[PDB]
Amino acid sequence: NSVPGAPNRVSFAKLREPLEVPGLLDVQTDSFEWLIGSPRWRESAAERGDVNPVGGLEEVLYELSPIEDFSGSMSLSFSDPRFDDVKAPVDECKDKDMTYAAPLFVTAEFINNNTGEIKSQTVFMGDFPMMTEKGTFIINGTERVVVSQLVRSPGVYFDETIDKSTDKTLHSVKVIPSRGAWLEFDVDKRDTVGVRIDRKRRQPVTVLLKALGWTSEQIVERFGFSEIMRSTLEKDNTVGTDEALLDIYRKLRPGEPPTKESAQTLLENLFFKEKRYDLARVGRYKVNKKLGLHVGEPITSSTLTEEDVVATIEYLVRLHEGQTTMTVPGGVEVPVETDDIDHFGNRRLRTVGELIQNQIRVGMSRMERVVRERMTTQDVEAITPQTLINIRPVVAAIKEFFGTSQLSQFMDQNNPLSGLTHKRRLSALGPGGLSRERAGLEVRDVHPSHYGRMCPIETPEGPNIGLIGSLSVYARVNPFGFIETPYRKVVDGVVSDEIVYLTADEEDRHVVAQANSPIDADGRFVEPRVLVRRKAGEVEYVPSSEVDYMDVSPRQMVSVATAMIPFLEHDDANRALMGANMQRQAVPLVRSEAPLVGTGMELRAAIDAGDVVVAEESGVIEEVSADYITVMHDNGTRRTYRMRKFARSNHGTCANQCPIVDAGDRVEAGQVIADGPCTDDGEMALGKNLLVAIMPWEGHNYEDAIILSNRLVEEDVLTSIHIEEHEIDARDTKLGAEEITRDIPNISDEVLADLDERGIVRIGAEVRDGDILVGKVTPKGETELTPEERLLRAIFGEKAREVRDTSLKVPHGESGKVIGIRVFSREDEDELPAGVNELVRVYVAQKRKISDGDKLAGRHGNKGVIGKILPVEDMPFLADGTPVDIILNTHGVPRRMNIGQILETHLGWCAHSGWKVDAAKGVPDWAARLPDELLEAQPNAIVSTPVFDGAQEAELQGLLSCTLPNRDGDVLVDADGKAMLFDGRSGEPFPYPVTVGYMYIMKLHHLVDDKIHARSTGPYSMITQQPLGGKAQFGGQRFGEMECWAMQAYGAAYTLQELLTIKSDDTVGRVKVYEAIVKGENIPEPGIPESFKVLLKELQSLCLNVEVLSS
Amino acid sequence: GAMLDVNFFDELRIGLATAEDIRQWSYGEVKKPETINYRTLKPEKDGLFCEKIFGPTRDWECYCGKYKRVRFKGIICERCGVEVTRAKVRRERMGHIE
Amino acid sequence: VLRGSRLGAVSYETDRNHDLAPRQIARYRTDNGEEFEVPFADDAEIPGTWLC
Amino acid sequence: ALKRLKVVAAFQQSGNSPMGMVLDAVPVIPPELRPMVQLDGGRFATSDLNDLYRRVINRNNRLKRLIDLGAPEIIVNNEKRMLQESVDALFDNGRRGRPVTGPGNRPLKSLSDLLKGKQGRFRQNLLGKRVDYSGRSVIVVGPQLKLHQCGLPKLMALELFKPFVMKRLVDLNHAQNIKSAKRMVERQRPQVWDVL
Amino acid sequence: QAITRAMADQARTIRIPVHMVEVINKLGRIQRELLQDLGREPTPEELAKEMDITPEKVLEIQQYAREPISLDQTIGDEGDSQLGDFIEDSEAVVAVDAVSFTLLQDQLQSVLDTLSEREAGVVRLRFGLTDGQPRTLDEIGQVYGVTRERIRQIESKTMSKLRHPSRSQVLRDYL
Ligand SMILES: [Zn+2]
């Protein structure tokens, strides 16, 4: 429901949902339209207060303007950014290898103070790349996703450590800004209060207080409660503000002579001025919230203050003393406690608009440096904003962010789930956040403040586990960058329908119930004591009126890819992590059916991903073809929607779109009008439903291998289309110009048969490994030919052929049909790089059957390669005569704790066969909580068990005991879920019943045709002469240290020597080995490897006299 | 001891090279911070890629093309100074900066 | 796949040792008394100074 | 005195003189161990040691100009200190001070960086290499095999055993010579599997 | 003047002279002004008309203004692999060309050996198959005591013999 033409998927769920799932690309689109300053953002911010908001671009231009030279006689300031329409639409940008962008215009203004003159222009600032309707960027023709970054927010961070020599609690502070110099405040093993101002040595805090200008009477009056402060005031042996400033200056800038004004202004121009220190709006907000300084005041003047420094030291000494509350004079009370730096109220999120804003700010700093620099040279009253402004650094900053950055990534296009999960990703690493090797084991953990904000399950399993996560389903992001999650407000024990979005601090202040606690039909709790979540991750039982919030749903804590695993709470967390990560490696198949047992997430994850065509406005379908759908709206006007037929995605797969509407059908707004890569009738469909048996079978499924039927090869069940793109270009050389032609040097007319009369293949032609695709030739020059070659040319009459053949050929192991050619030319005014006269792209598509070595999976972490593809007739078959389609091994299930796959197999059999609960003498006791019209189902019913609220084991037992016969009255699978099978080879019945059912398996993008390589002799490196590495070359395999130790442990001196000399490095021995194999002789003796000679020349060039001695 | 490295080694000795060792290994002094010509892409004389110091770029040719076969093997061209020999000696000849 | 050339040629010849062109040896002397031998071709004019 | 006598006795008991710790000439590594290659498309790529050597030559030539010009000692000492720091950055970059960076604030790779570490000469190229006659694929279970047997896919075996099958194709008169035998193996004629 | 001429001499690895650095800086200023005052990256025709040169000279200057990339930079993101591990040495011995040339030398020597002695000697001394030095017809004529036109005539008749299918079938595959 709520989607206008959705298929009827009956749900096993028992609880009502108060809040619908949000837009699942809001994390991208809301941030970028904040950065623009869209009217949609402006009214959405006007809804949440009238706080006079400013966009990201206006914020950067306001904090930059006005730019003034040293004399103060002239100023340049910016205002009012504007965007034109985009230069070309998204499909044209992708087709023509362009960037989807819009021109940005700002209003610059120049003031000459001594006369009074306003010279105002309108300055073009560059082609700003725009975000499409799905949260992506088309940068140079490719679709890119900017990933949000998890960082530590600026603020004050109090913490304590316990000593191990004296066993004292040593408290400390760090106040860390964005863009500034740090300062700390320790309390050491002696009773002293220190300062390490800007990572210098140490000094007592009274030095810093006197340098700020505090007398000892003032210090005693303020810190009169602290014996620590009294002792460190007495033991400092430095009295006087000038003396303290001298003591600071003597170590802060060592070597510079202390002048009085420089010493007096060093502290102010290091911290308190907006040039070199500005903790941001978030940092000022967090400092004011921690110390309680300004309660309701709007956040401005984001530099540090002396009241902030004195409040920090006062907080530190009261924390060391052991109090729990304090108040600064002129503020509110705050609790006194230490800080956790991994807490999600201290970890913020630099989203896409903020990352682009930082790069704009970096570019405009260089622009204003050049503004001052050429403002001093040029004659005044002759200059104007377009003579002051050089926009080339801003253009280059945005360009080098969008290409070659860590957080601007190639979009994951395997299926719609990969695409939707690449957005909504929170990566902790990148430029400005922690590394991978230098990251501790404490930031890779799941913290109790991730509940509802980050998913505990979905994370990589490689060396990135914990450093990349995913947003939860209901989570929002603050104006400041903090992740919120919604809660239902409960008052006097009655759960109302107010939804409040709480960040992790306010959640720590309250006590939050659980979404499945019982409710007496008006909101009032049924039980007397409710299970809750308290301040520190404590889970208790409190009285029912102590509660003041409640989760909106179970599965509030999970993400999109994790909410699609049925029966998740019966799987262990390792196998759920694997299942969620393998779900976004499935390939699009040629037919794509939807699961029998799913959760309810598959529809919304398919509409929100965007590979489905959705009717924007209601109408009636006027004309359908395979290329377009044109609907005629209710007021005259029509609209046609082109489909994307057989388009290569970023990873080689196919991106077909198929209409699913008839030619007179009435559609509604929001109704799915055409399918996508991996969807069936509008909902995400990544695999196929296959009949499974859970026996072992003759060793062919030993240790996660898999046996398949040959029906899945004959009937094209698991068959997929993969497209490859090959590119060549013909540019100018020193000796002439390369050209694309059929008149190649000496090759036969056999290999020139499929080439049209410009040297490109014909569309539809089958290509093998080594076939010419584009015939190119380059000018060679003049060389000296061998006497043997000259004699052969004189015998056979051939000429010199002053051009050298360098064509584009199909690489090793590839084939397919040529389906498309895209040629760009210099003379037709296509925008090619300098030098290139022509560029040709050929598309070769092939259709891949399933074969052994290919990797399949289910949704519960059960992967495995195919070991055998049996014939149909030697497969275990039911008493019907029906063969099974896949055989999975028994030994792999119970030691992995993923019996969600077994309960899915049972429910899938019941959904295939259908059922009918016998409510003759009333409803049976196990079906008392079953929703009505789950009390019968037709064959091939689609059902849905949601994640933490689904079908119970009592319900699966009952539905197994009532299920429909096949064609005769023959119930083939008994009340345990087990069937009697026959052996396909011997013919005898298997002696015990076997578990059968329908599991939804999917085919993963780890196919054999990409994995296999071999090499006898190929390319070699340049400095050291060892083989290159990789399948993209020919590429050798590496024989490293551990393999050498295995050879030495065996005792294989000759095998090891031959591997390390005449198979890598011995340059004159490689050729003699080849010649000796071909002539049939004995393999010769090895020589010195070339890497040893390179080592000796590097040791000699470090001035070391290394020499080899004889005897 | 051995310098061509035919594999009868007994020892490998390391030590500290003096200036006489350095300017005895060297085949010539490099005295320009030049690498190749920007137009013809051929090495510059006395530069970091010089053929008179480090040996020729093409097998058995000099720099000016005056001597171009194995018949002239081991002689030095009287014009450009490039010894006509193999091109793989540019992995073996050192130079020095004074 | 990146493919680059250090701009030189590799010839396929048999490195013989017998039928070689005649050479004459000059001897030069720098201003600190060092001495060097330069093998010039036999039919070639020996220069007056040489950069050693 | 014990810690001093280690290095004083090292210089005594050998034939080393301690004068080799100060440099009067700097050796220059051969050119093809620091090459300048021309890529596809006319672009050049070079090897980060040419920049360090060029800094040494530039500052040395300018020092010769200042000494023969007769400049004051402030200028001459600043030039000598710069020459010393450039030779230090050639041998070991970032050991003393800030490293010399290239474009993009990336530090240049000096002569001691070619030797040290997991990616240096000793551990990357000498104790373990990449090898010819070498393949890789993905394993499946072979329960019909004996213990001394493996199943090798024929498309991998044809590439590993390519010179042996070229020799045998010539020997059985399926090919006239090694060139046409290599063409038969590359185009995968039906005689190739019988020979393999 | 000293700072600017030194920067022209010493800024780049491949040294461009001072006058070419001056026209590169001129083209840079012209291109910046046209991009600012046009709202679009100018064409080579617009640059060549603003700077009074031909539209191919603009491309020659713009391709001389390219700086080398580094062989020692990490081309990956996680594998810590440099650029120089991806560049195939396009001038190494291919190890099957080197043995094919050997077998071609042997086969060509066999086919020449099954002719007559003086007829094979004429072709070997003509094409320099023994010492790499192709002599002329008068040199071979004074070698065998014959005249130049008779040397040319017997050379033509040996080429007619060697163009036979019975000789050239074993050598057709080596081209
Ligand atoms: Zn020469």
UniProtKB/Swiss-Prot annotation, chain A:
HAMAP family: RNApol_bact_RpoB
NCBIfam families xref list: PRK00405.1 (NF001616), rpoB (TIGR02013)
Disulphide bridges: none
Documented EC number(s): 2.7.7.6
A biological-process GO annotation: DNA-templated transcription
Species whose genome carries this gene: Mycobacterium tuberculosis (strain ATCC 25177 / H37Ra)
Subunit-structure text: The RNAP catalytic core consists of 2 alpha, 1 beta, 1 beta' and 1 omega subunit. When a sigma factor is associated with the core the holoenzyme is formed, which can initiate transcription.
Function: DNA-dependent RNA polymerase catalyzes the transcription of DNA into RNA using the four ribonucleoside triphosphates as substrates.
Top EC category: transferase
Catalytic activity: RNA(n) + a ribonucleoside 5'-triphosphate = RNA(n+1) + diphosphate
Listed name of the protein: DNA-directed RNA polymerase subunit beta
Entry GO CC: DNA-directed RNA polymerase complex
Family: Belongs to the RNA polymerase beta chain family.
PROSITE patterns documented for this protein: RNA_POL_BETA (PS01166)
InterPro entries in UniProt: DNA-dir_RNA_pol_bsu_ext_1_sf, DNA-dir_RNA_pol_bsu_external_1, DNA-dir_RNA_pol_su2, DNA-dir_RNAP_su2_dom, DNA-dir_RNAP_su2_hyb_sf, RNA_pol_bsu_bac, RNA_pol_bsu_CS, RNA_pol_bsu_protrusion
CDD domains: RNA_pol_B_RPB2
Keywords noted in UniProt: DNA-directed RNA polymerase, Nucleotidyltransferase, Transcription, Transferase
A UniProt-annotated Pfam family: RNA_pol_Rpb2_2
Alphabetized GO MF terms: DNA binding; DNA-directed RNA polymerase activity; ribonucleoside binding
Domain of life according to the entry: Bacteria
UniProtKB/Swiss-Prot annotation, chain C:
Coiled-coil segments: none
Assembly description: Forms a complex with the RNAP catalytic core and with free principal sigma factors.
Role description: Binds to RNA polymerase (RNAP), stimulating transcription from principal, but not alternative sigma factor promoters.
Sequence similarity: Belongs to the RNA polymerase-binding protein RbpA family.
Protein name as annotated: RNA polymerase-binding protein RbpA
Native species: Mycobacterium tuberculosis (strain CDC 1551 / Oshkosh)
Gene expressing this chain: rbpA
